Amino acid sequence: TFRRLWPTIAPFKAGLIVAGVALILNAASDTFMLSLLKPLLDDGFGKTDRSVLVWMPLVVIGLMILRGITSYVSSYCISWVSGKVVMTMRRRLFGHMMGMPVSFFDKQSTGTLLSRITYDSEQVASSSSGALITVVREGASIIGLFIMMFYYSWQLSIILIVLAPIVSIAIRVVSKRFRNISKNMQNTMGQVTTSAEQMLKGHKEVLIFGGQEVETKRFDKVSNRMRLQGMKMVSASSISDPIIQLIASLALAFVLYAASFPSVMDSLTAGTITVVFSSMIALMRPLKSLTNVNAQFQRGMAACQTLFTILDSEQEKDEGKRVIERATGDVEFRNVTFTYPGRDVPALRNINLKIPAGKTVALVGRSGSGKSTIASLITRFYDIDEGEILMDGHDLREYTLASLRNQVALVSQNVHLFNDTVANNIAYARTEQYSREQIEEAARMAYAMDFINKMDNGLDTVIGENGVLLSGGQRQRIAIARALLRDSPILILDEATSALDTESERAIQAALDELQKNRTSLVIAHRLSTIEKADEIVVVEDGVIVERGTHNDLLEHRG
Ligand X SMILES: CCCCCCCCCCCCCC(=O)O[C@H](CCCCCCCCCCC)CC(=O)O[C@@H]1[C@@H](NC(=O)C[C@@H](CCCCCCCCCCC)OC(=O)CCCCCCCCCCC)[C@H](OC[C@H]2O[C@H](OP(=O)(O)O)[C@H](NC(=O)C[C@H](O)CCCCCCCCCCC)[C@@H](OC(=O)C[C@H](O)CCCCCCCCCCC)[C@@H]2O)O[C@H](CO[C@]2(C(=O)O)C[C@@H](O[C@]3(C(=O)O)C[C@@H](O)[C@@H](O)[C@@H]([C@H](O)CO)O3)[C@@H](O[C@H]3O[C@H]([C@@H](O)CO)[C@@H](OP(=O)(O)O)[C@H](O[C@H]4O[C@H]([C@@H](O)CO[C@H]5O[C@H]([C@@H](O)CO)[C@@H](O)[C@H](O)[C@@H]5O)[C@@H](OP(=O)(O)O)[C@H](O)[C@@H]4O)[C@@H]3O)[C@@H]([C@H](O)CO)O2)[C@H]1OP(=O)(O)O
Site residues for a second copy, 85-104, by CB under 8 A, read 86-87, 90-91, 94-95, 97-99, 102
- Closest separation in Å from C-beta 235 to ligand X: 15
Rounded to whole angstroms, how far apart are CA atoms 445 and 439? 10
Please say which residue, 63 or 303, places its beta carbon nearer to a second copy.
Answer: 63
DSSP 8-state class, residue 544: E
Among 241-249, 264-272, 315-323, 363-371, the segment contacting ligand X (CB under 6 A): 241-249
| Of the residues 23, 124, 283, 374, which one makes contact with ligand X according to CB under 6 A | 283
Q: Decide if 379 contacts 410 (C-beta within 8 A).
A: yes
Nearest partner of 307 among 149, 93, 60, 160, judged by Cα: 93
DSSP letters spanning 392-429: TTEETTTB-HHHHHHHEEEE-TTPPP-SSBHHHHHT-S
Q: What share of the chain is helix, strand, coil (3-state, %, to 5)?
A: 60, 10, 35
* Residue 488 marked as a ligand binder: no
Residue 171 binds to ligand X (criterion: CB under 6 A): no
* Residue 370 marked as a ligand binder: yes
Residue 254 binds to ligand X (criterion: CB under 6 A): no
Chosen from ligand X, a second copy, none, partner binding at 160 (C-beta under 5 to 8 Å by type): ligand X
Chosen from ligand X, a second copy, none, partner binding at 535 (C-beta under 5 to 8 Å by type): none
Among 147-155, 236-244, 355-363, 516-524, the segment contacting a second copy (CB under 8 A): 236-244
Positions in 49-88 near a second copy (CB under 8 A): 49-50, 53-54, 56-58, 60-61, 64-65, 67-69, 71-72, 75-76, 79-80, 83-84, 86-87
Please say which residue, 64 or 231, places its beta carbon nearer to ligand X.
Answer: 64
| Of the residues 17, 21, 60, 169, which one makes contact with ligand X according to CB under 6 A | 60
Nearest partner of 525 among 543, 544, 503, 505, judged by Cα: 505
* 360: three-class secondary structure by DSSP: strand
Residue 30 binds to ligand X (criterion: CB under 6 A): yes
Question: CA dihedral defined by 396, 401, 407, 410, rounded to 10 degrees?
Answer: 100
Rounded to whole angstroms, how far apart are CA atoms 145 and 160? 11
Q: Decide if 70 contacts 25 (C-beta within 8 A).
A: yes
Residue 167 binds to ligand X (criterion: CB under 6 A): yes
Residue 170 binds to ligand X (criterion: CB under 6 A): no
Positions in 432-491 near a second copy (CB under 8 A): 464-466, 482
Please say which residue, 275 or 303, places its beta carbon nearer to a second copy.
Answer: 275
Rounded to whole angstroms, how far apart are CA atoms 446 and 510? 8
CA 285 to chain centre: 34
Q: Which residues are at the interface with ligand X (CB under 6 A)?
A: 30, 33-34, 36-37, 40, 56, 60, 64, 160, 163-164, 167, 241, 245, 248-249, 251-252, 274, 277-278, 280-285, 287
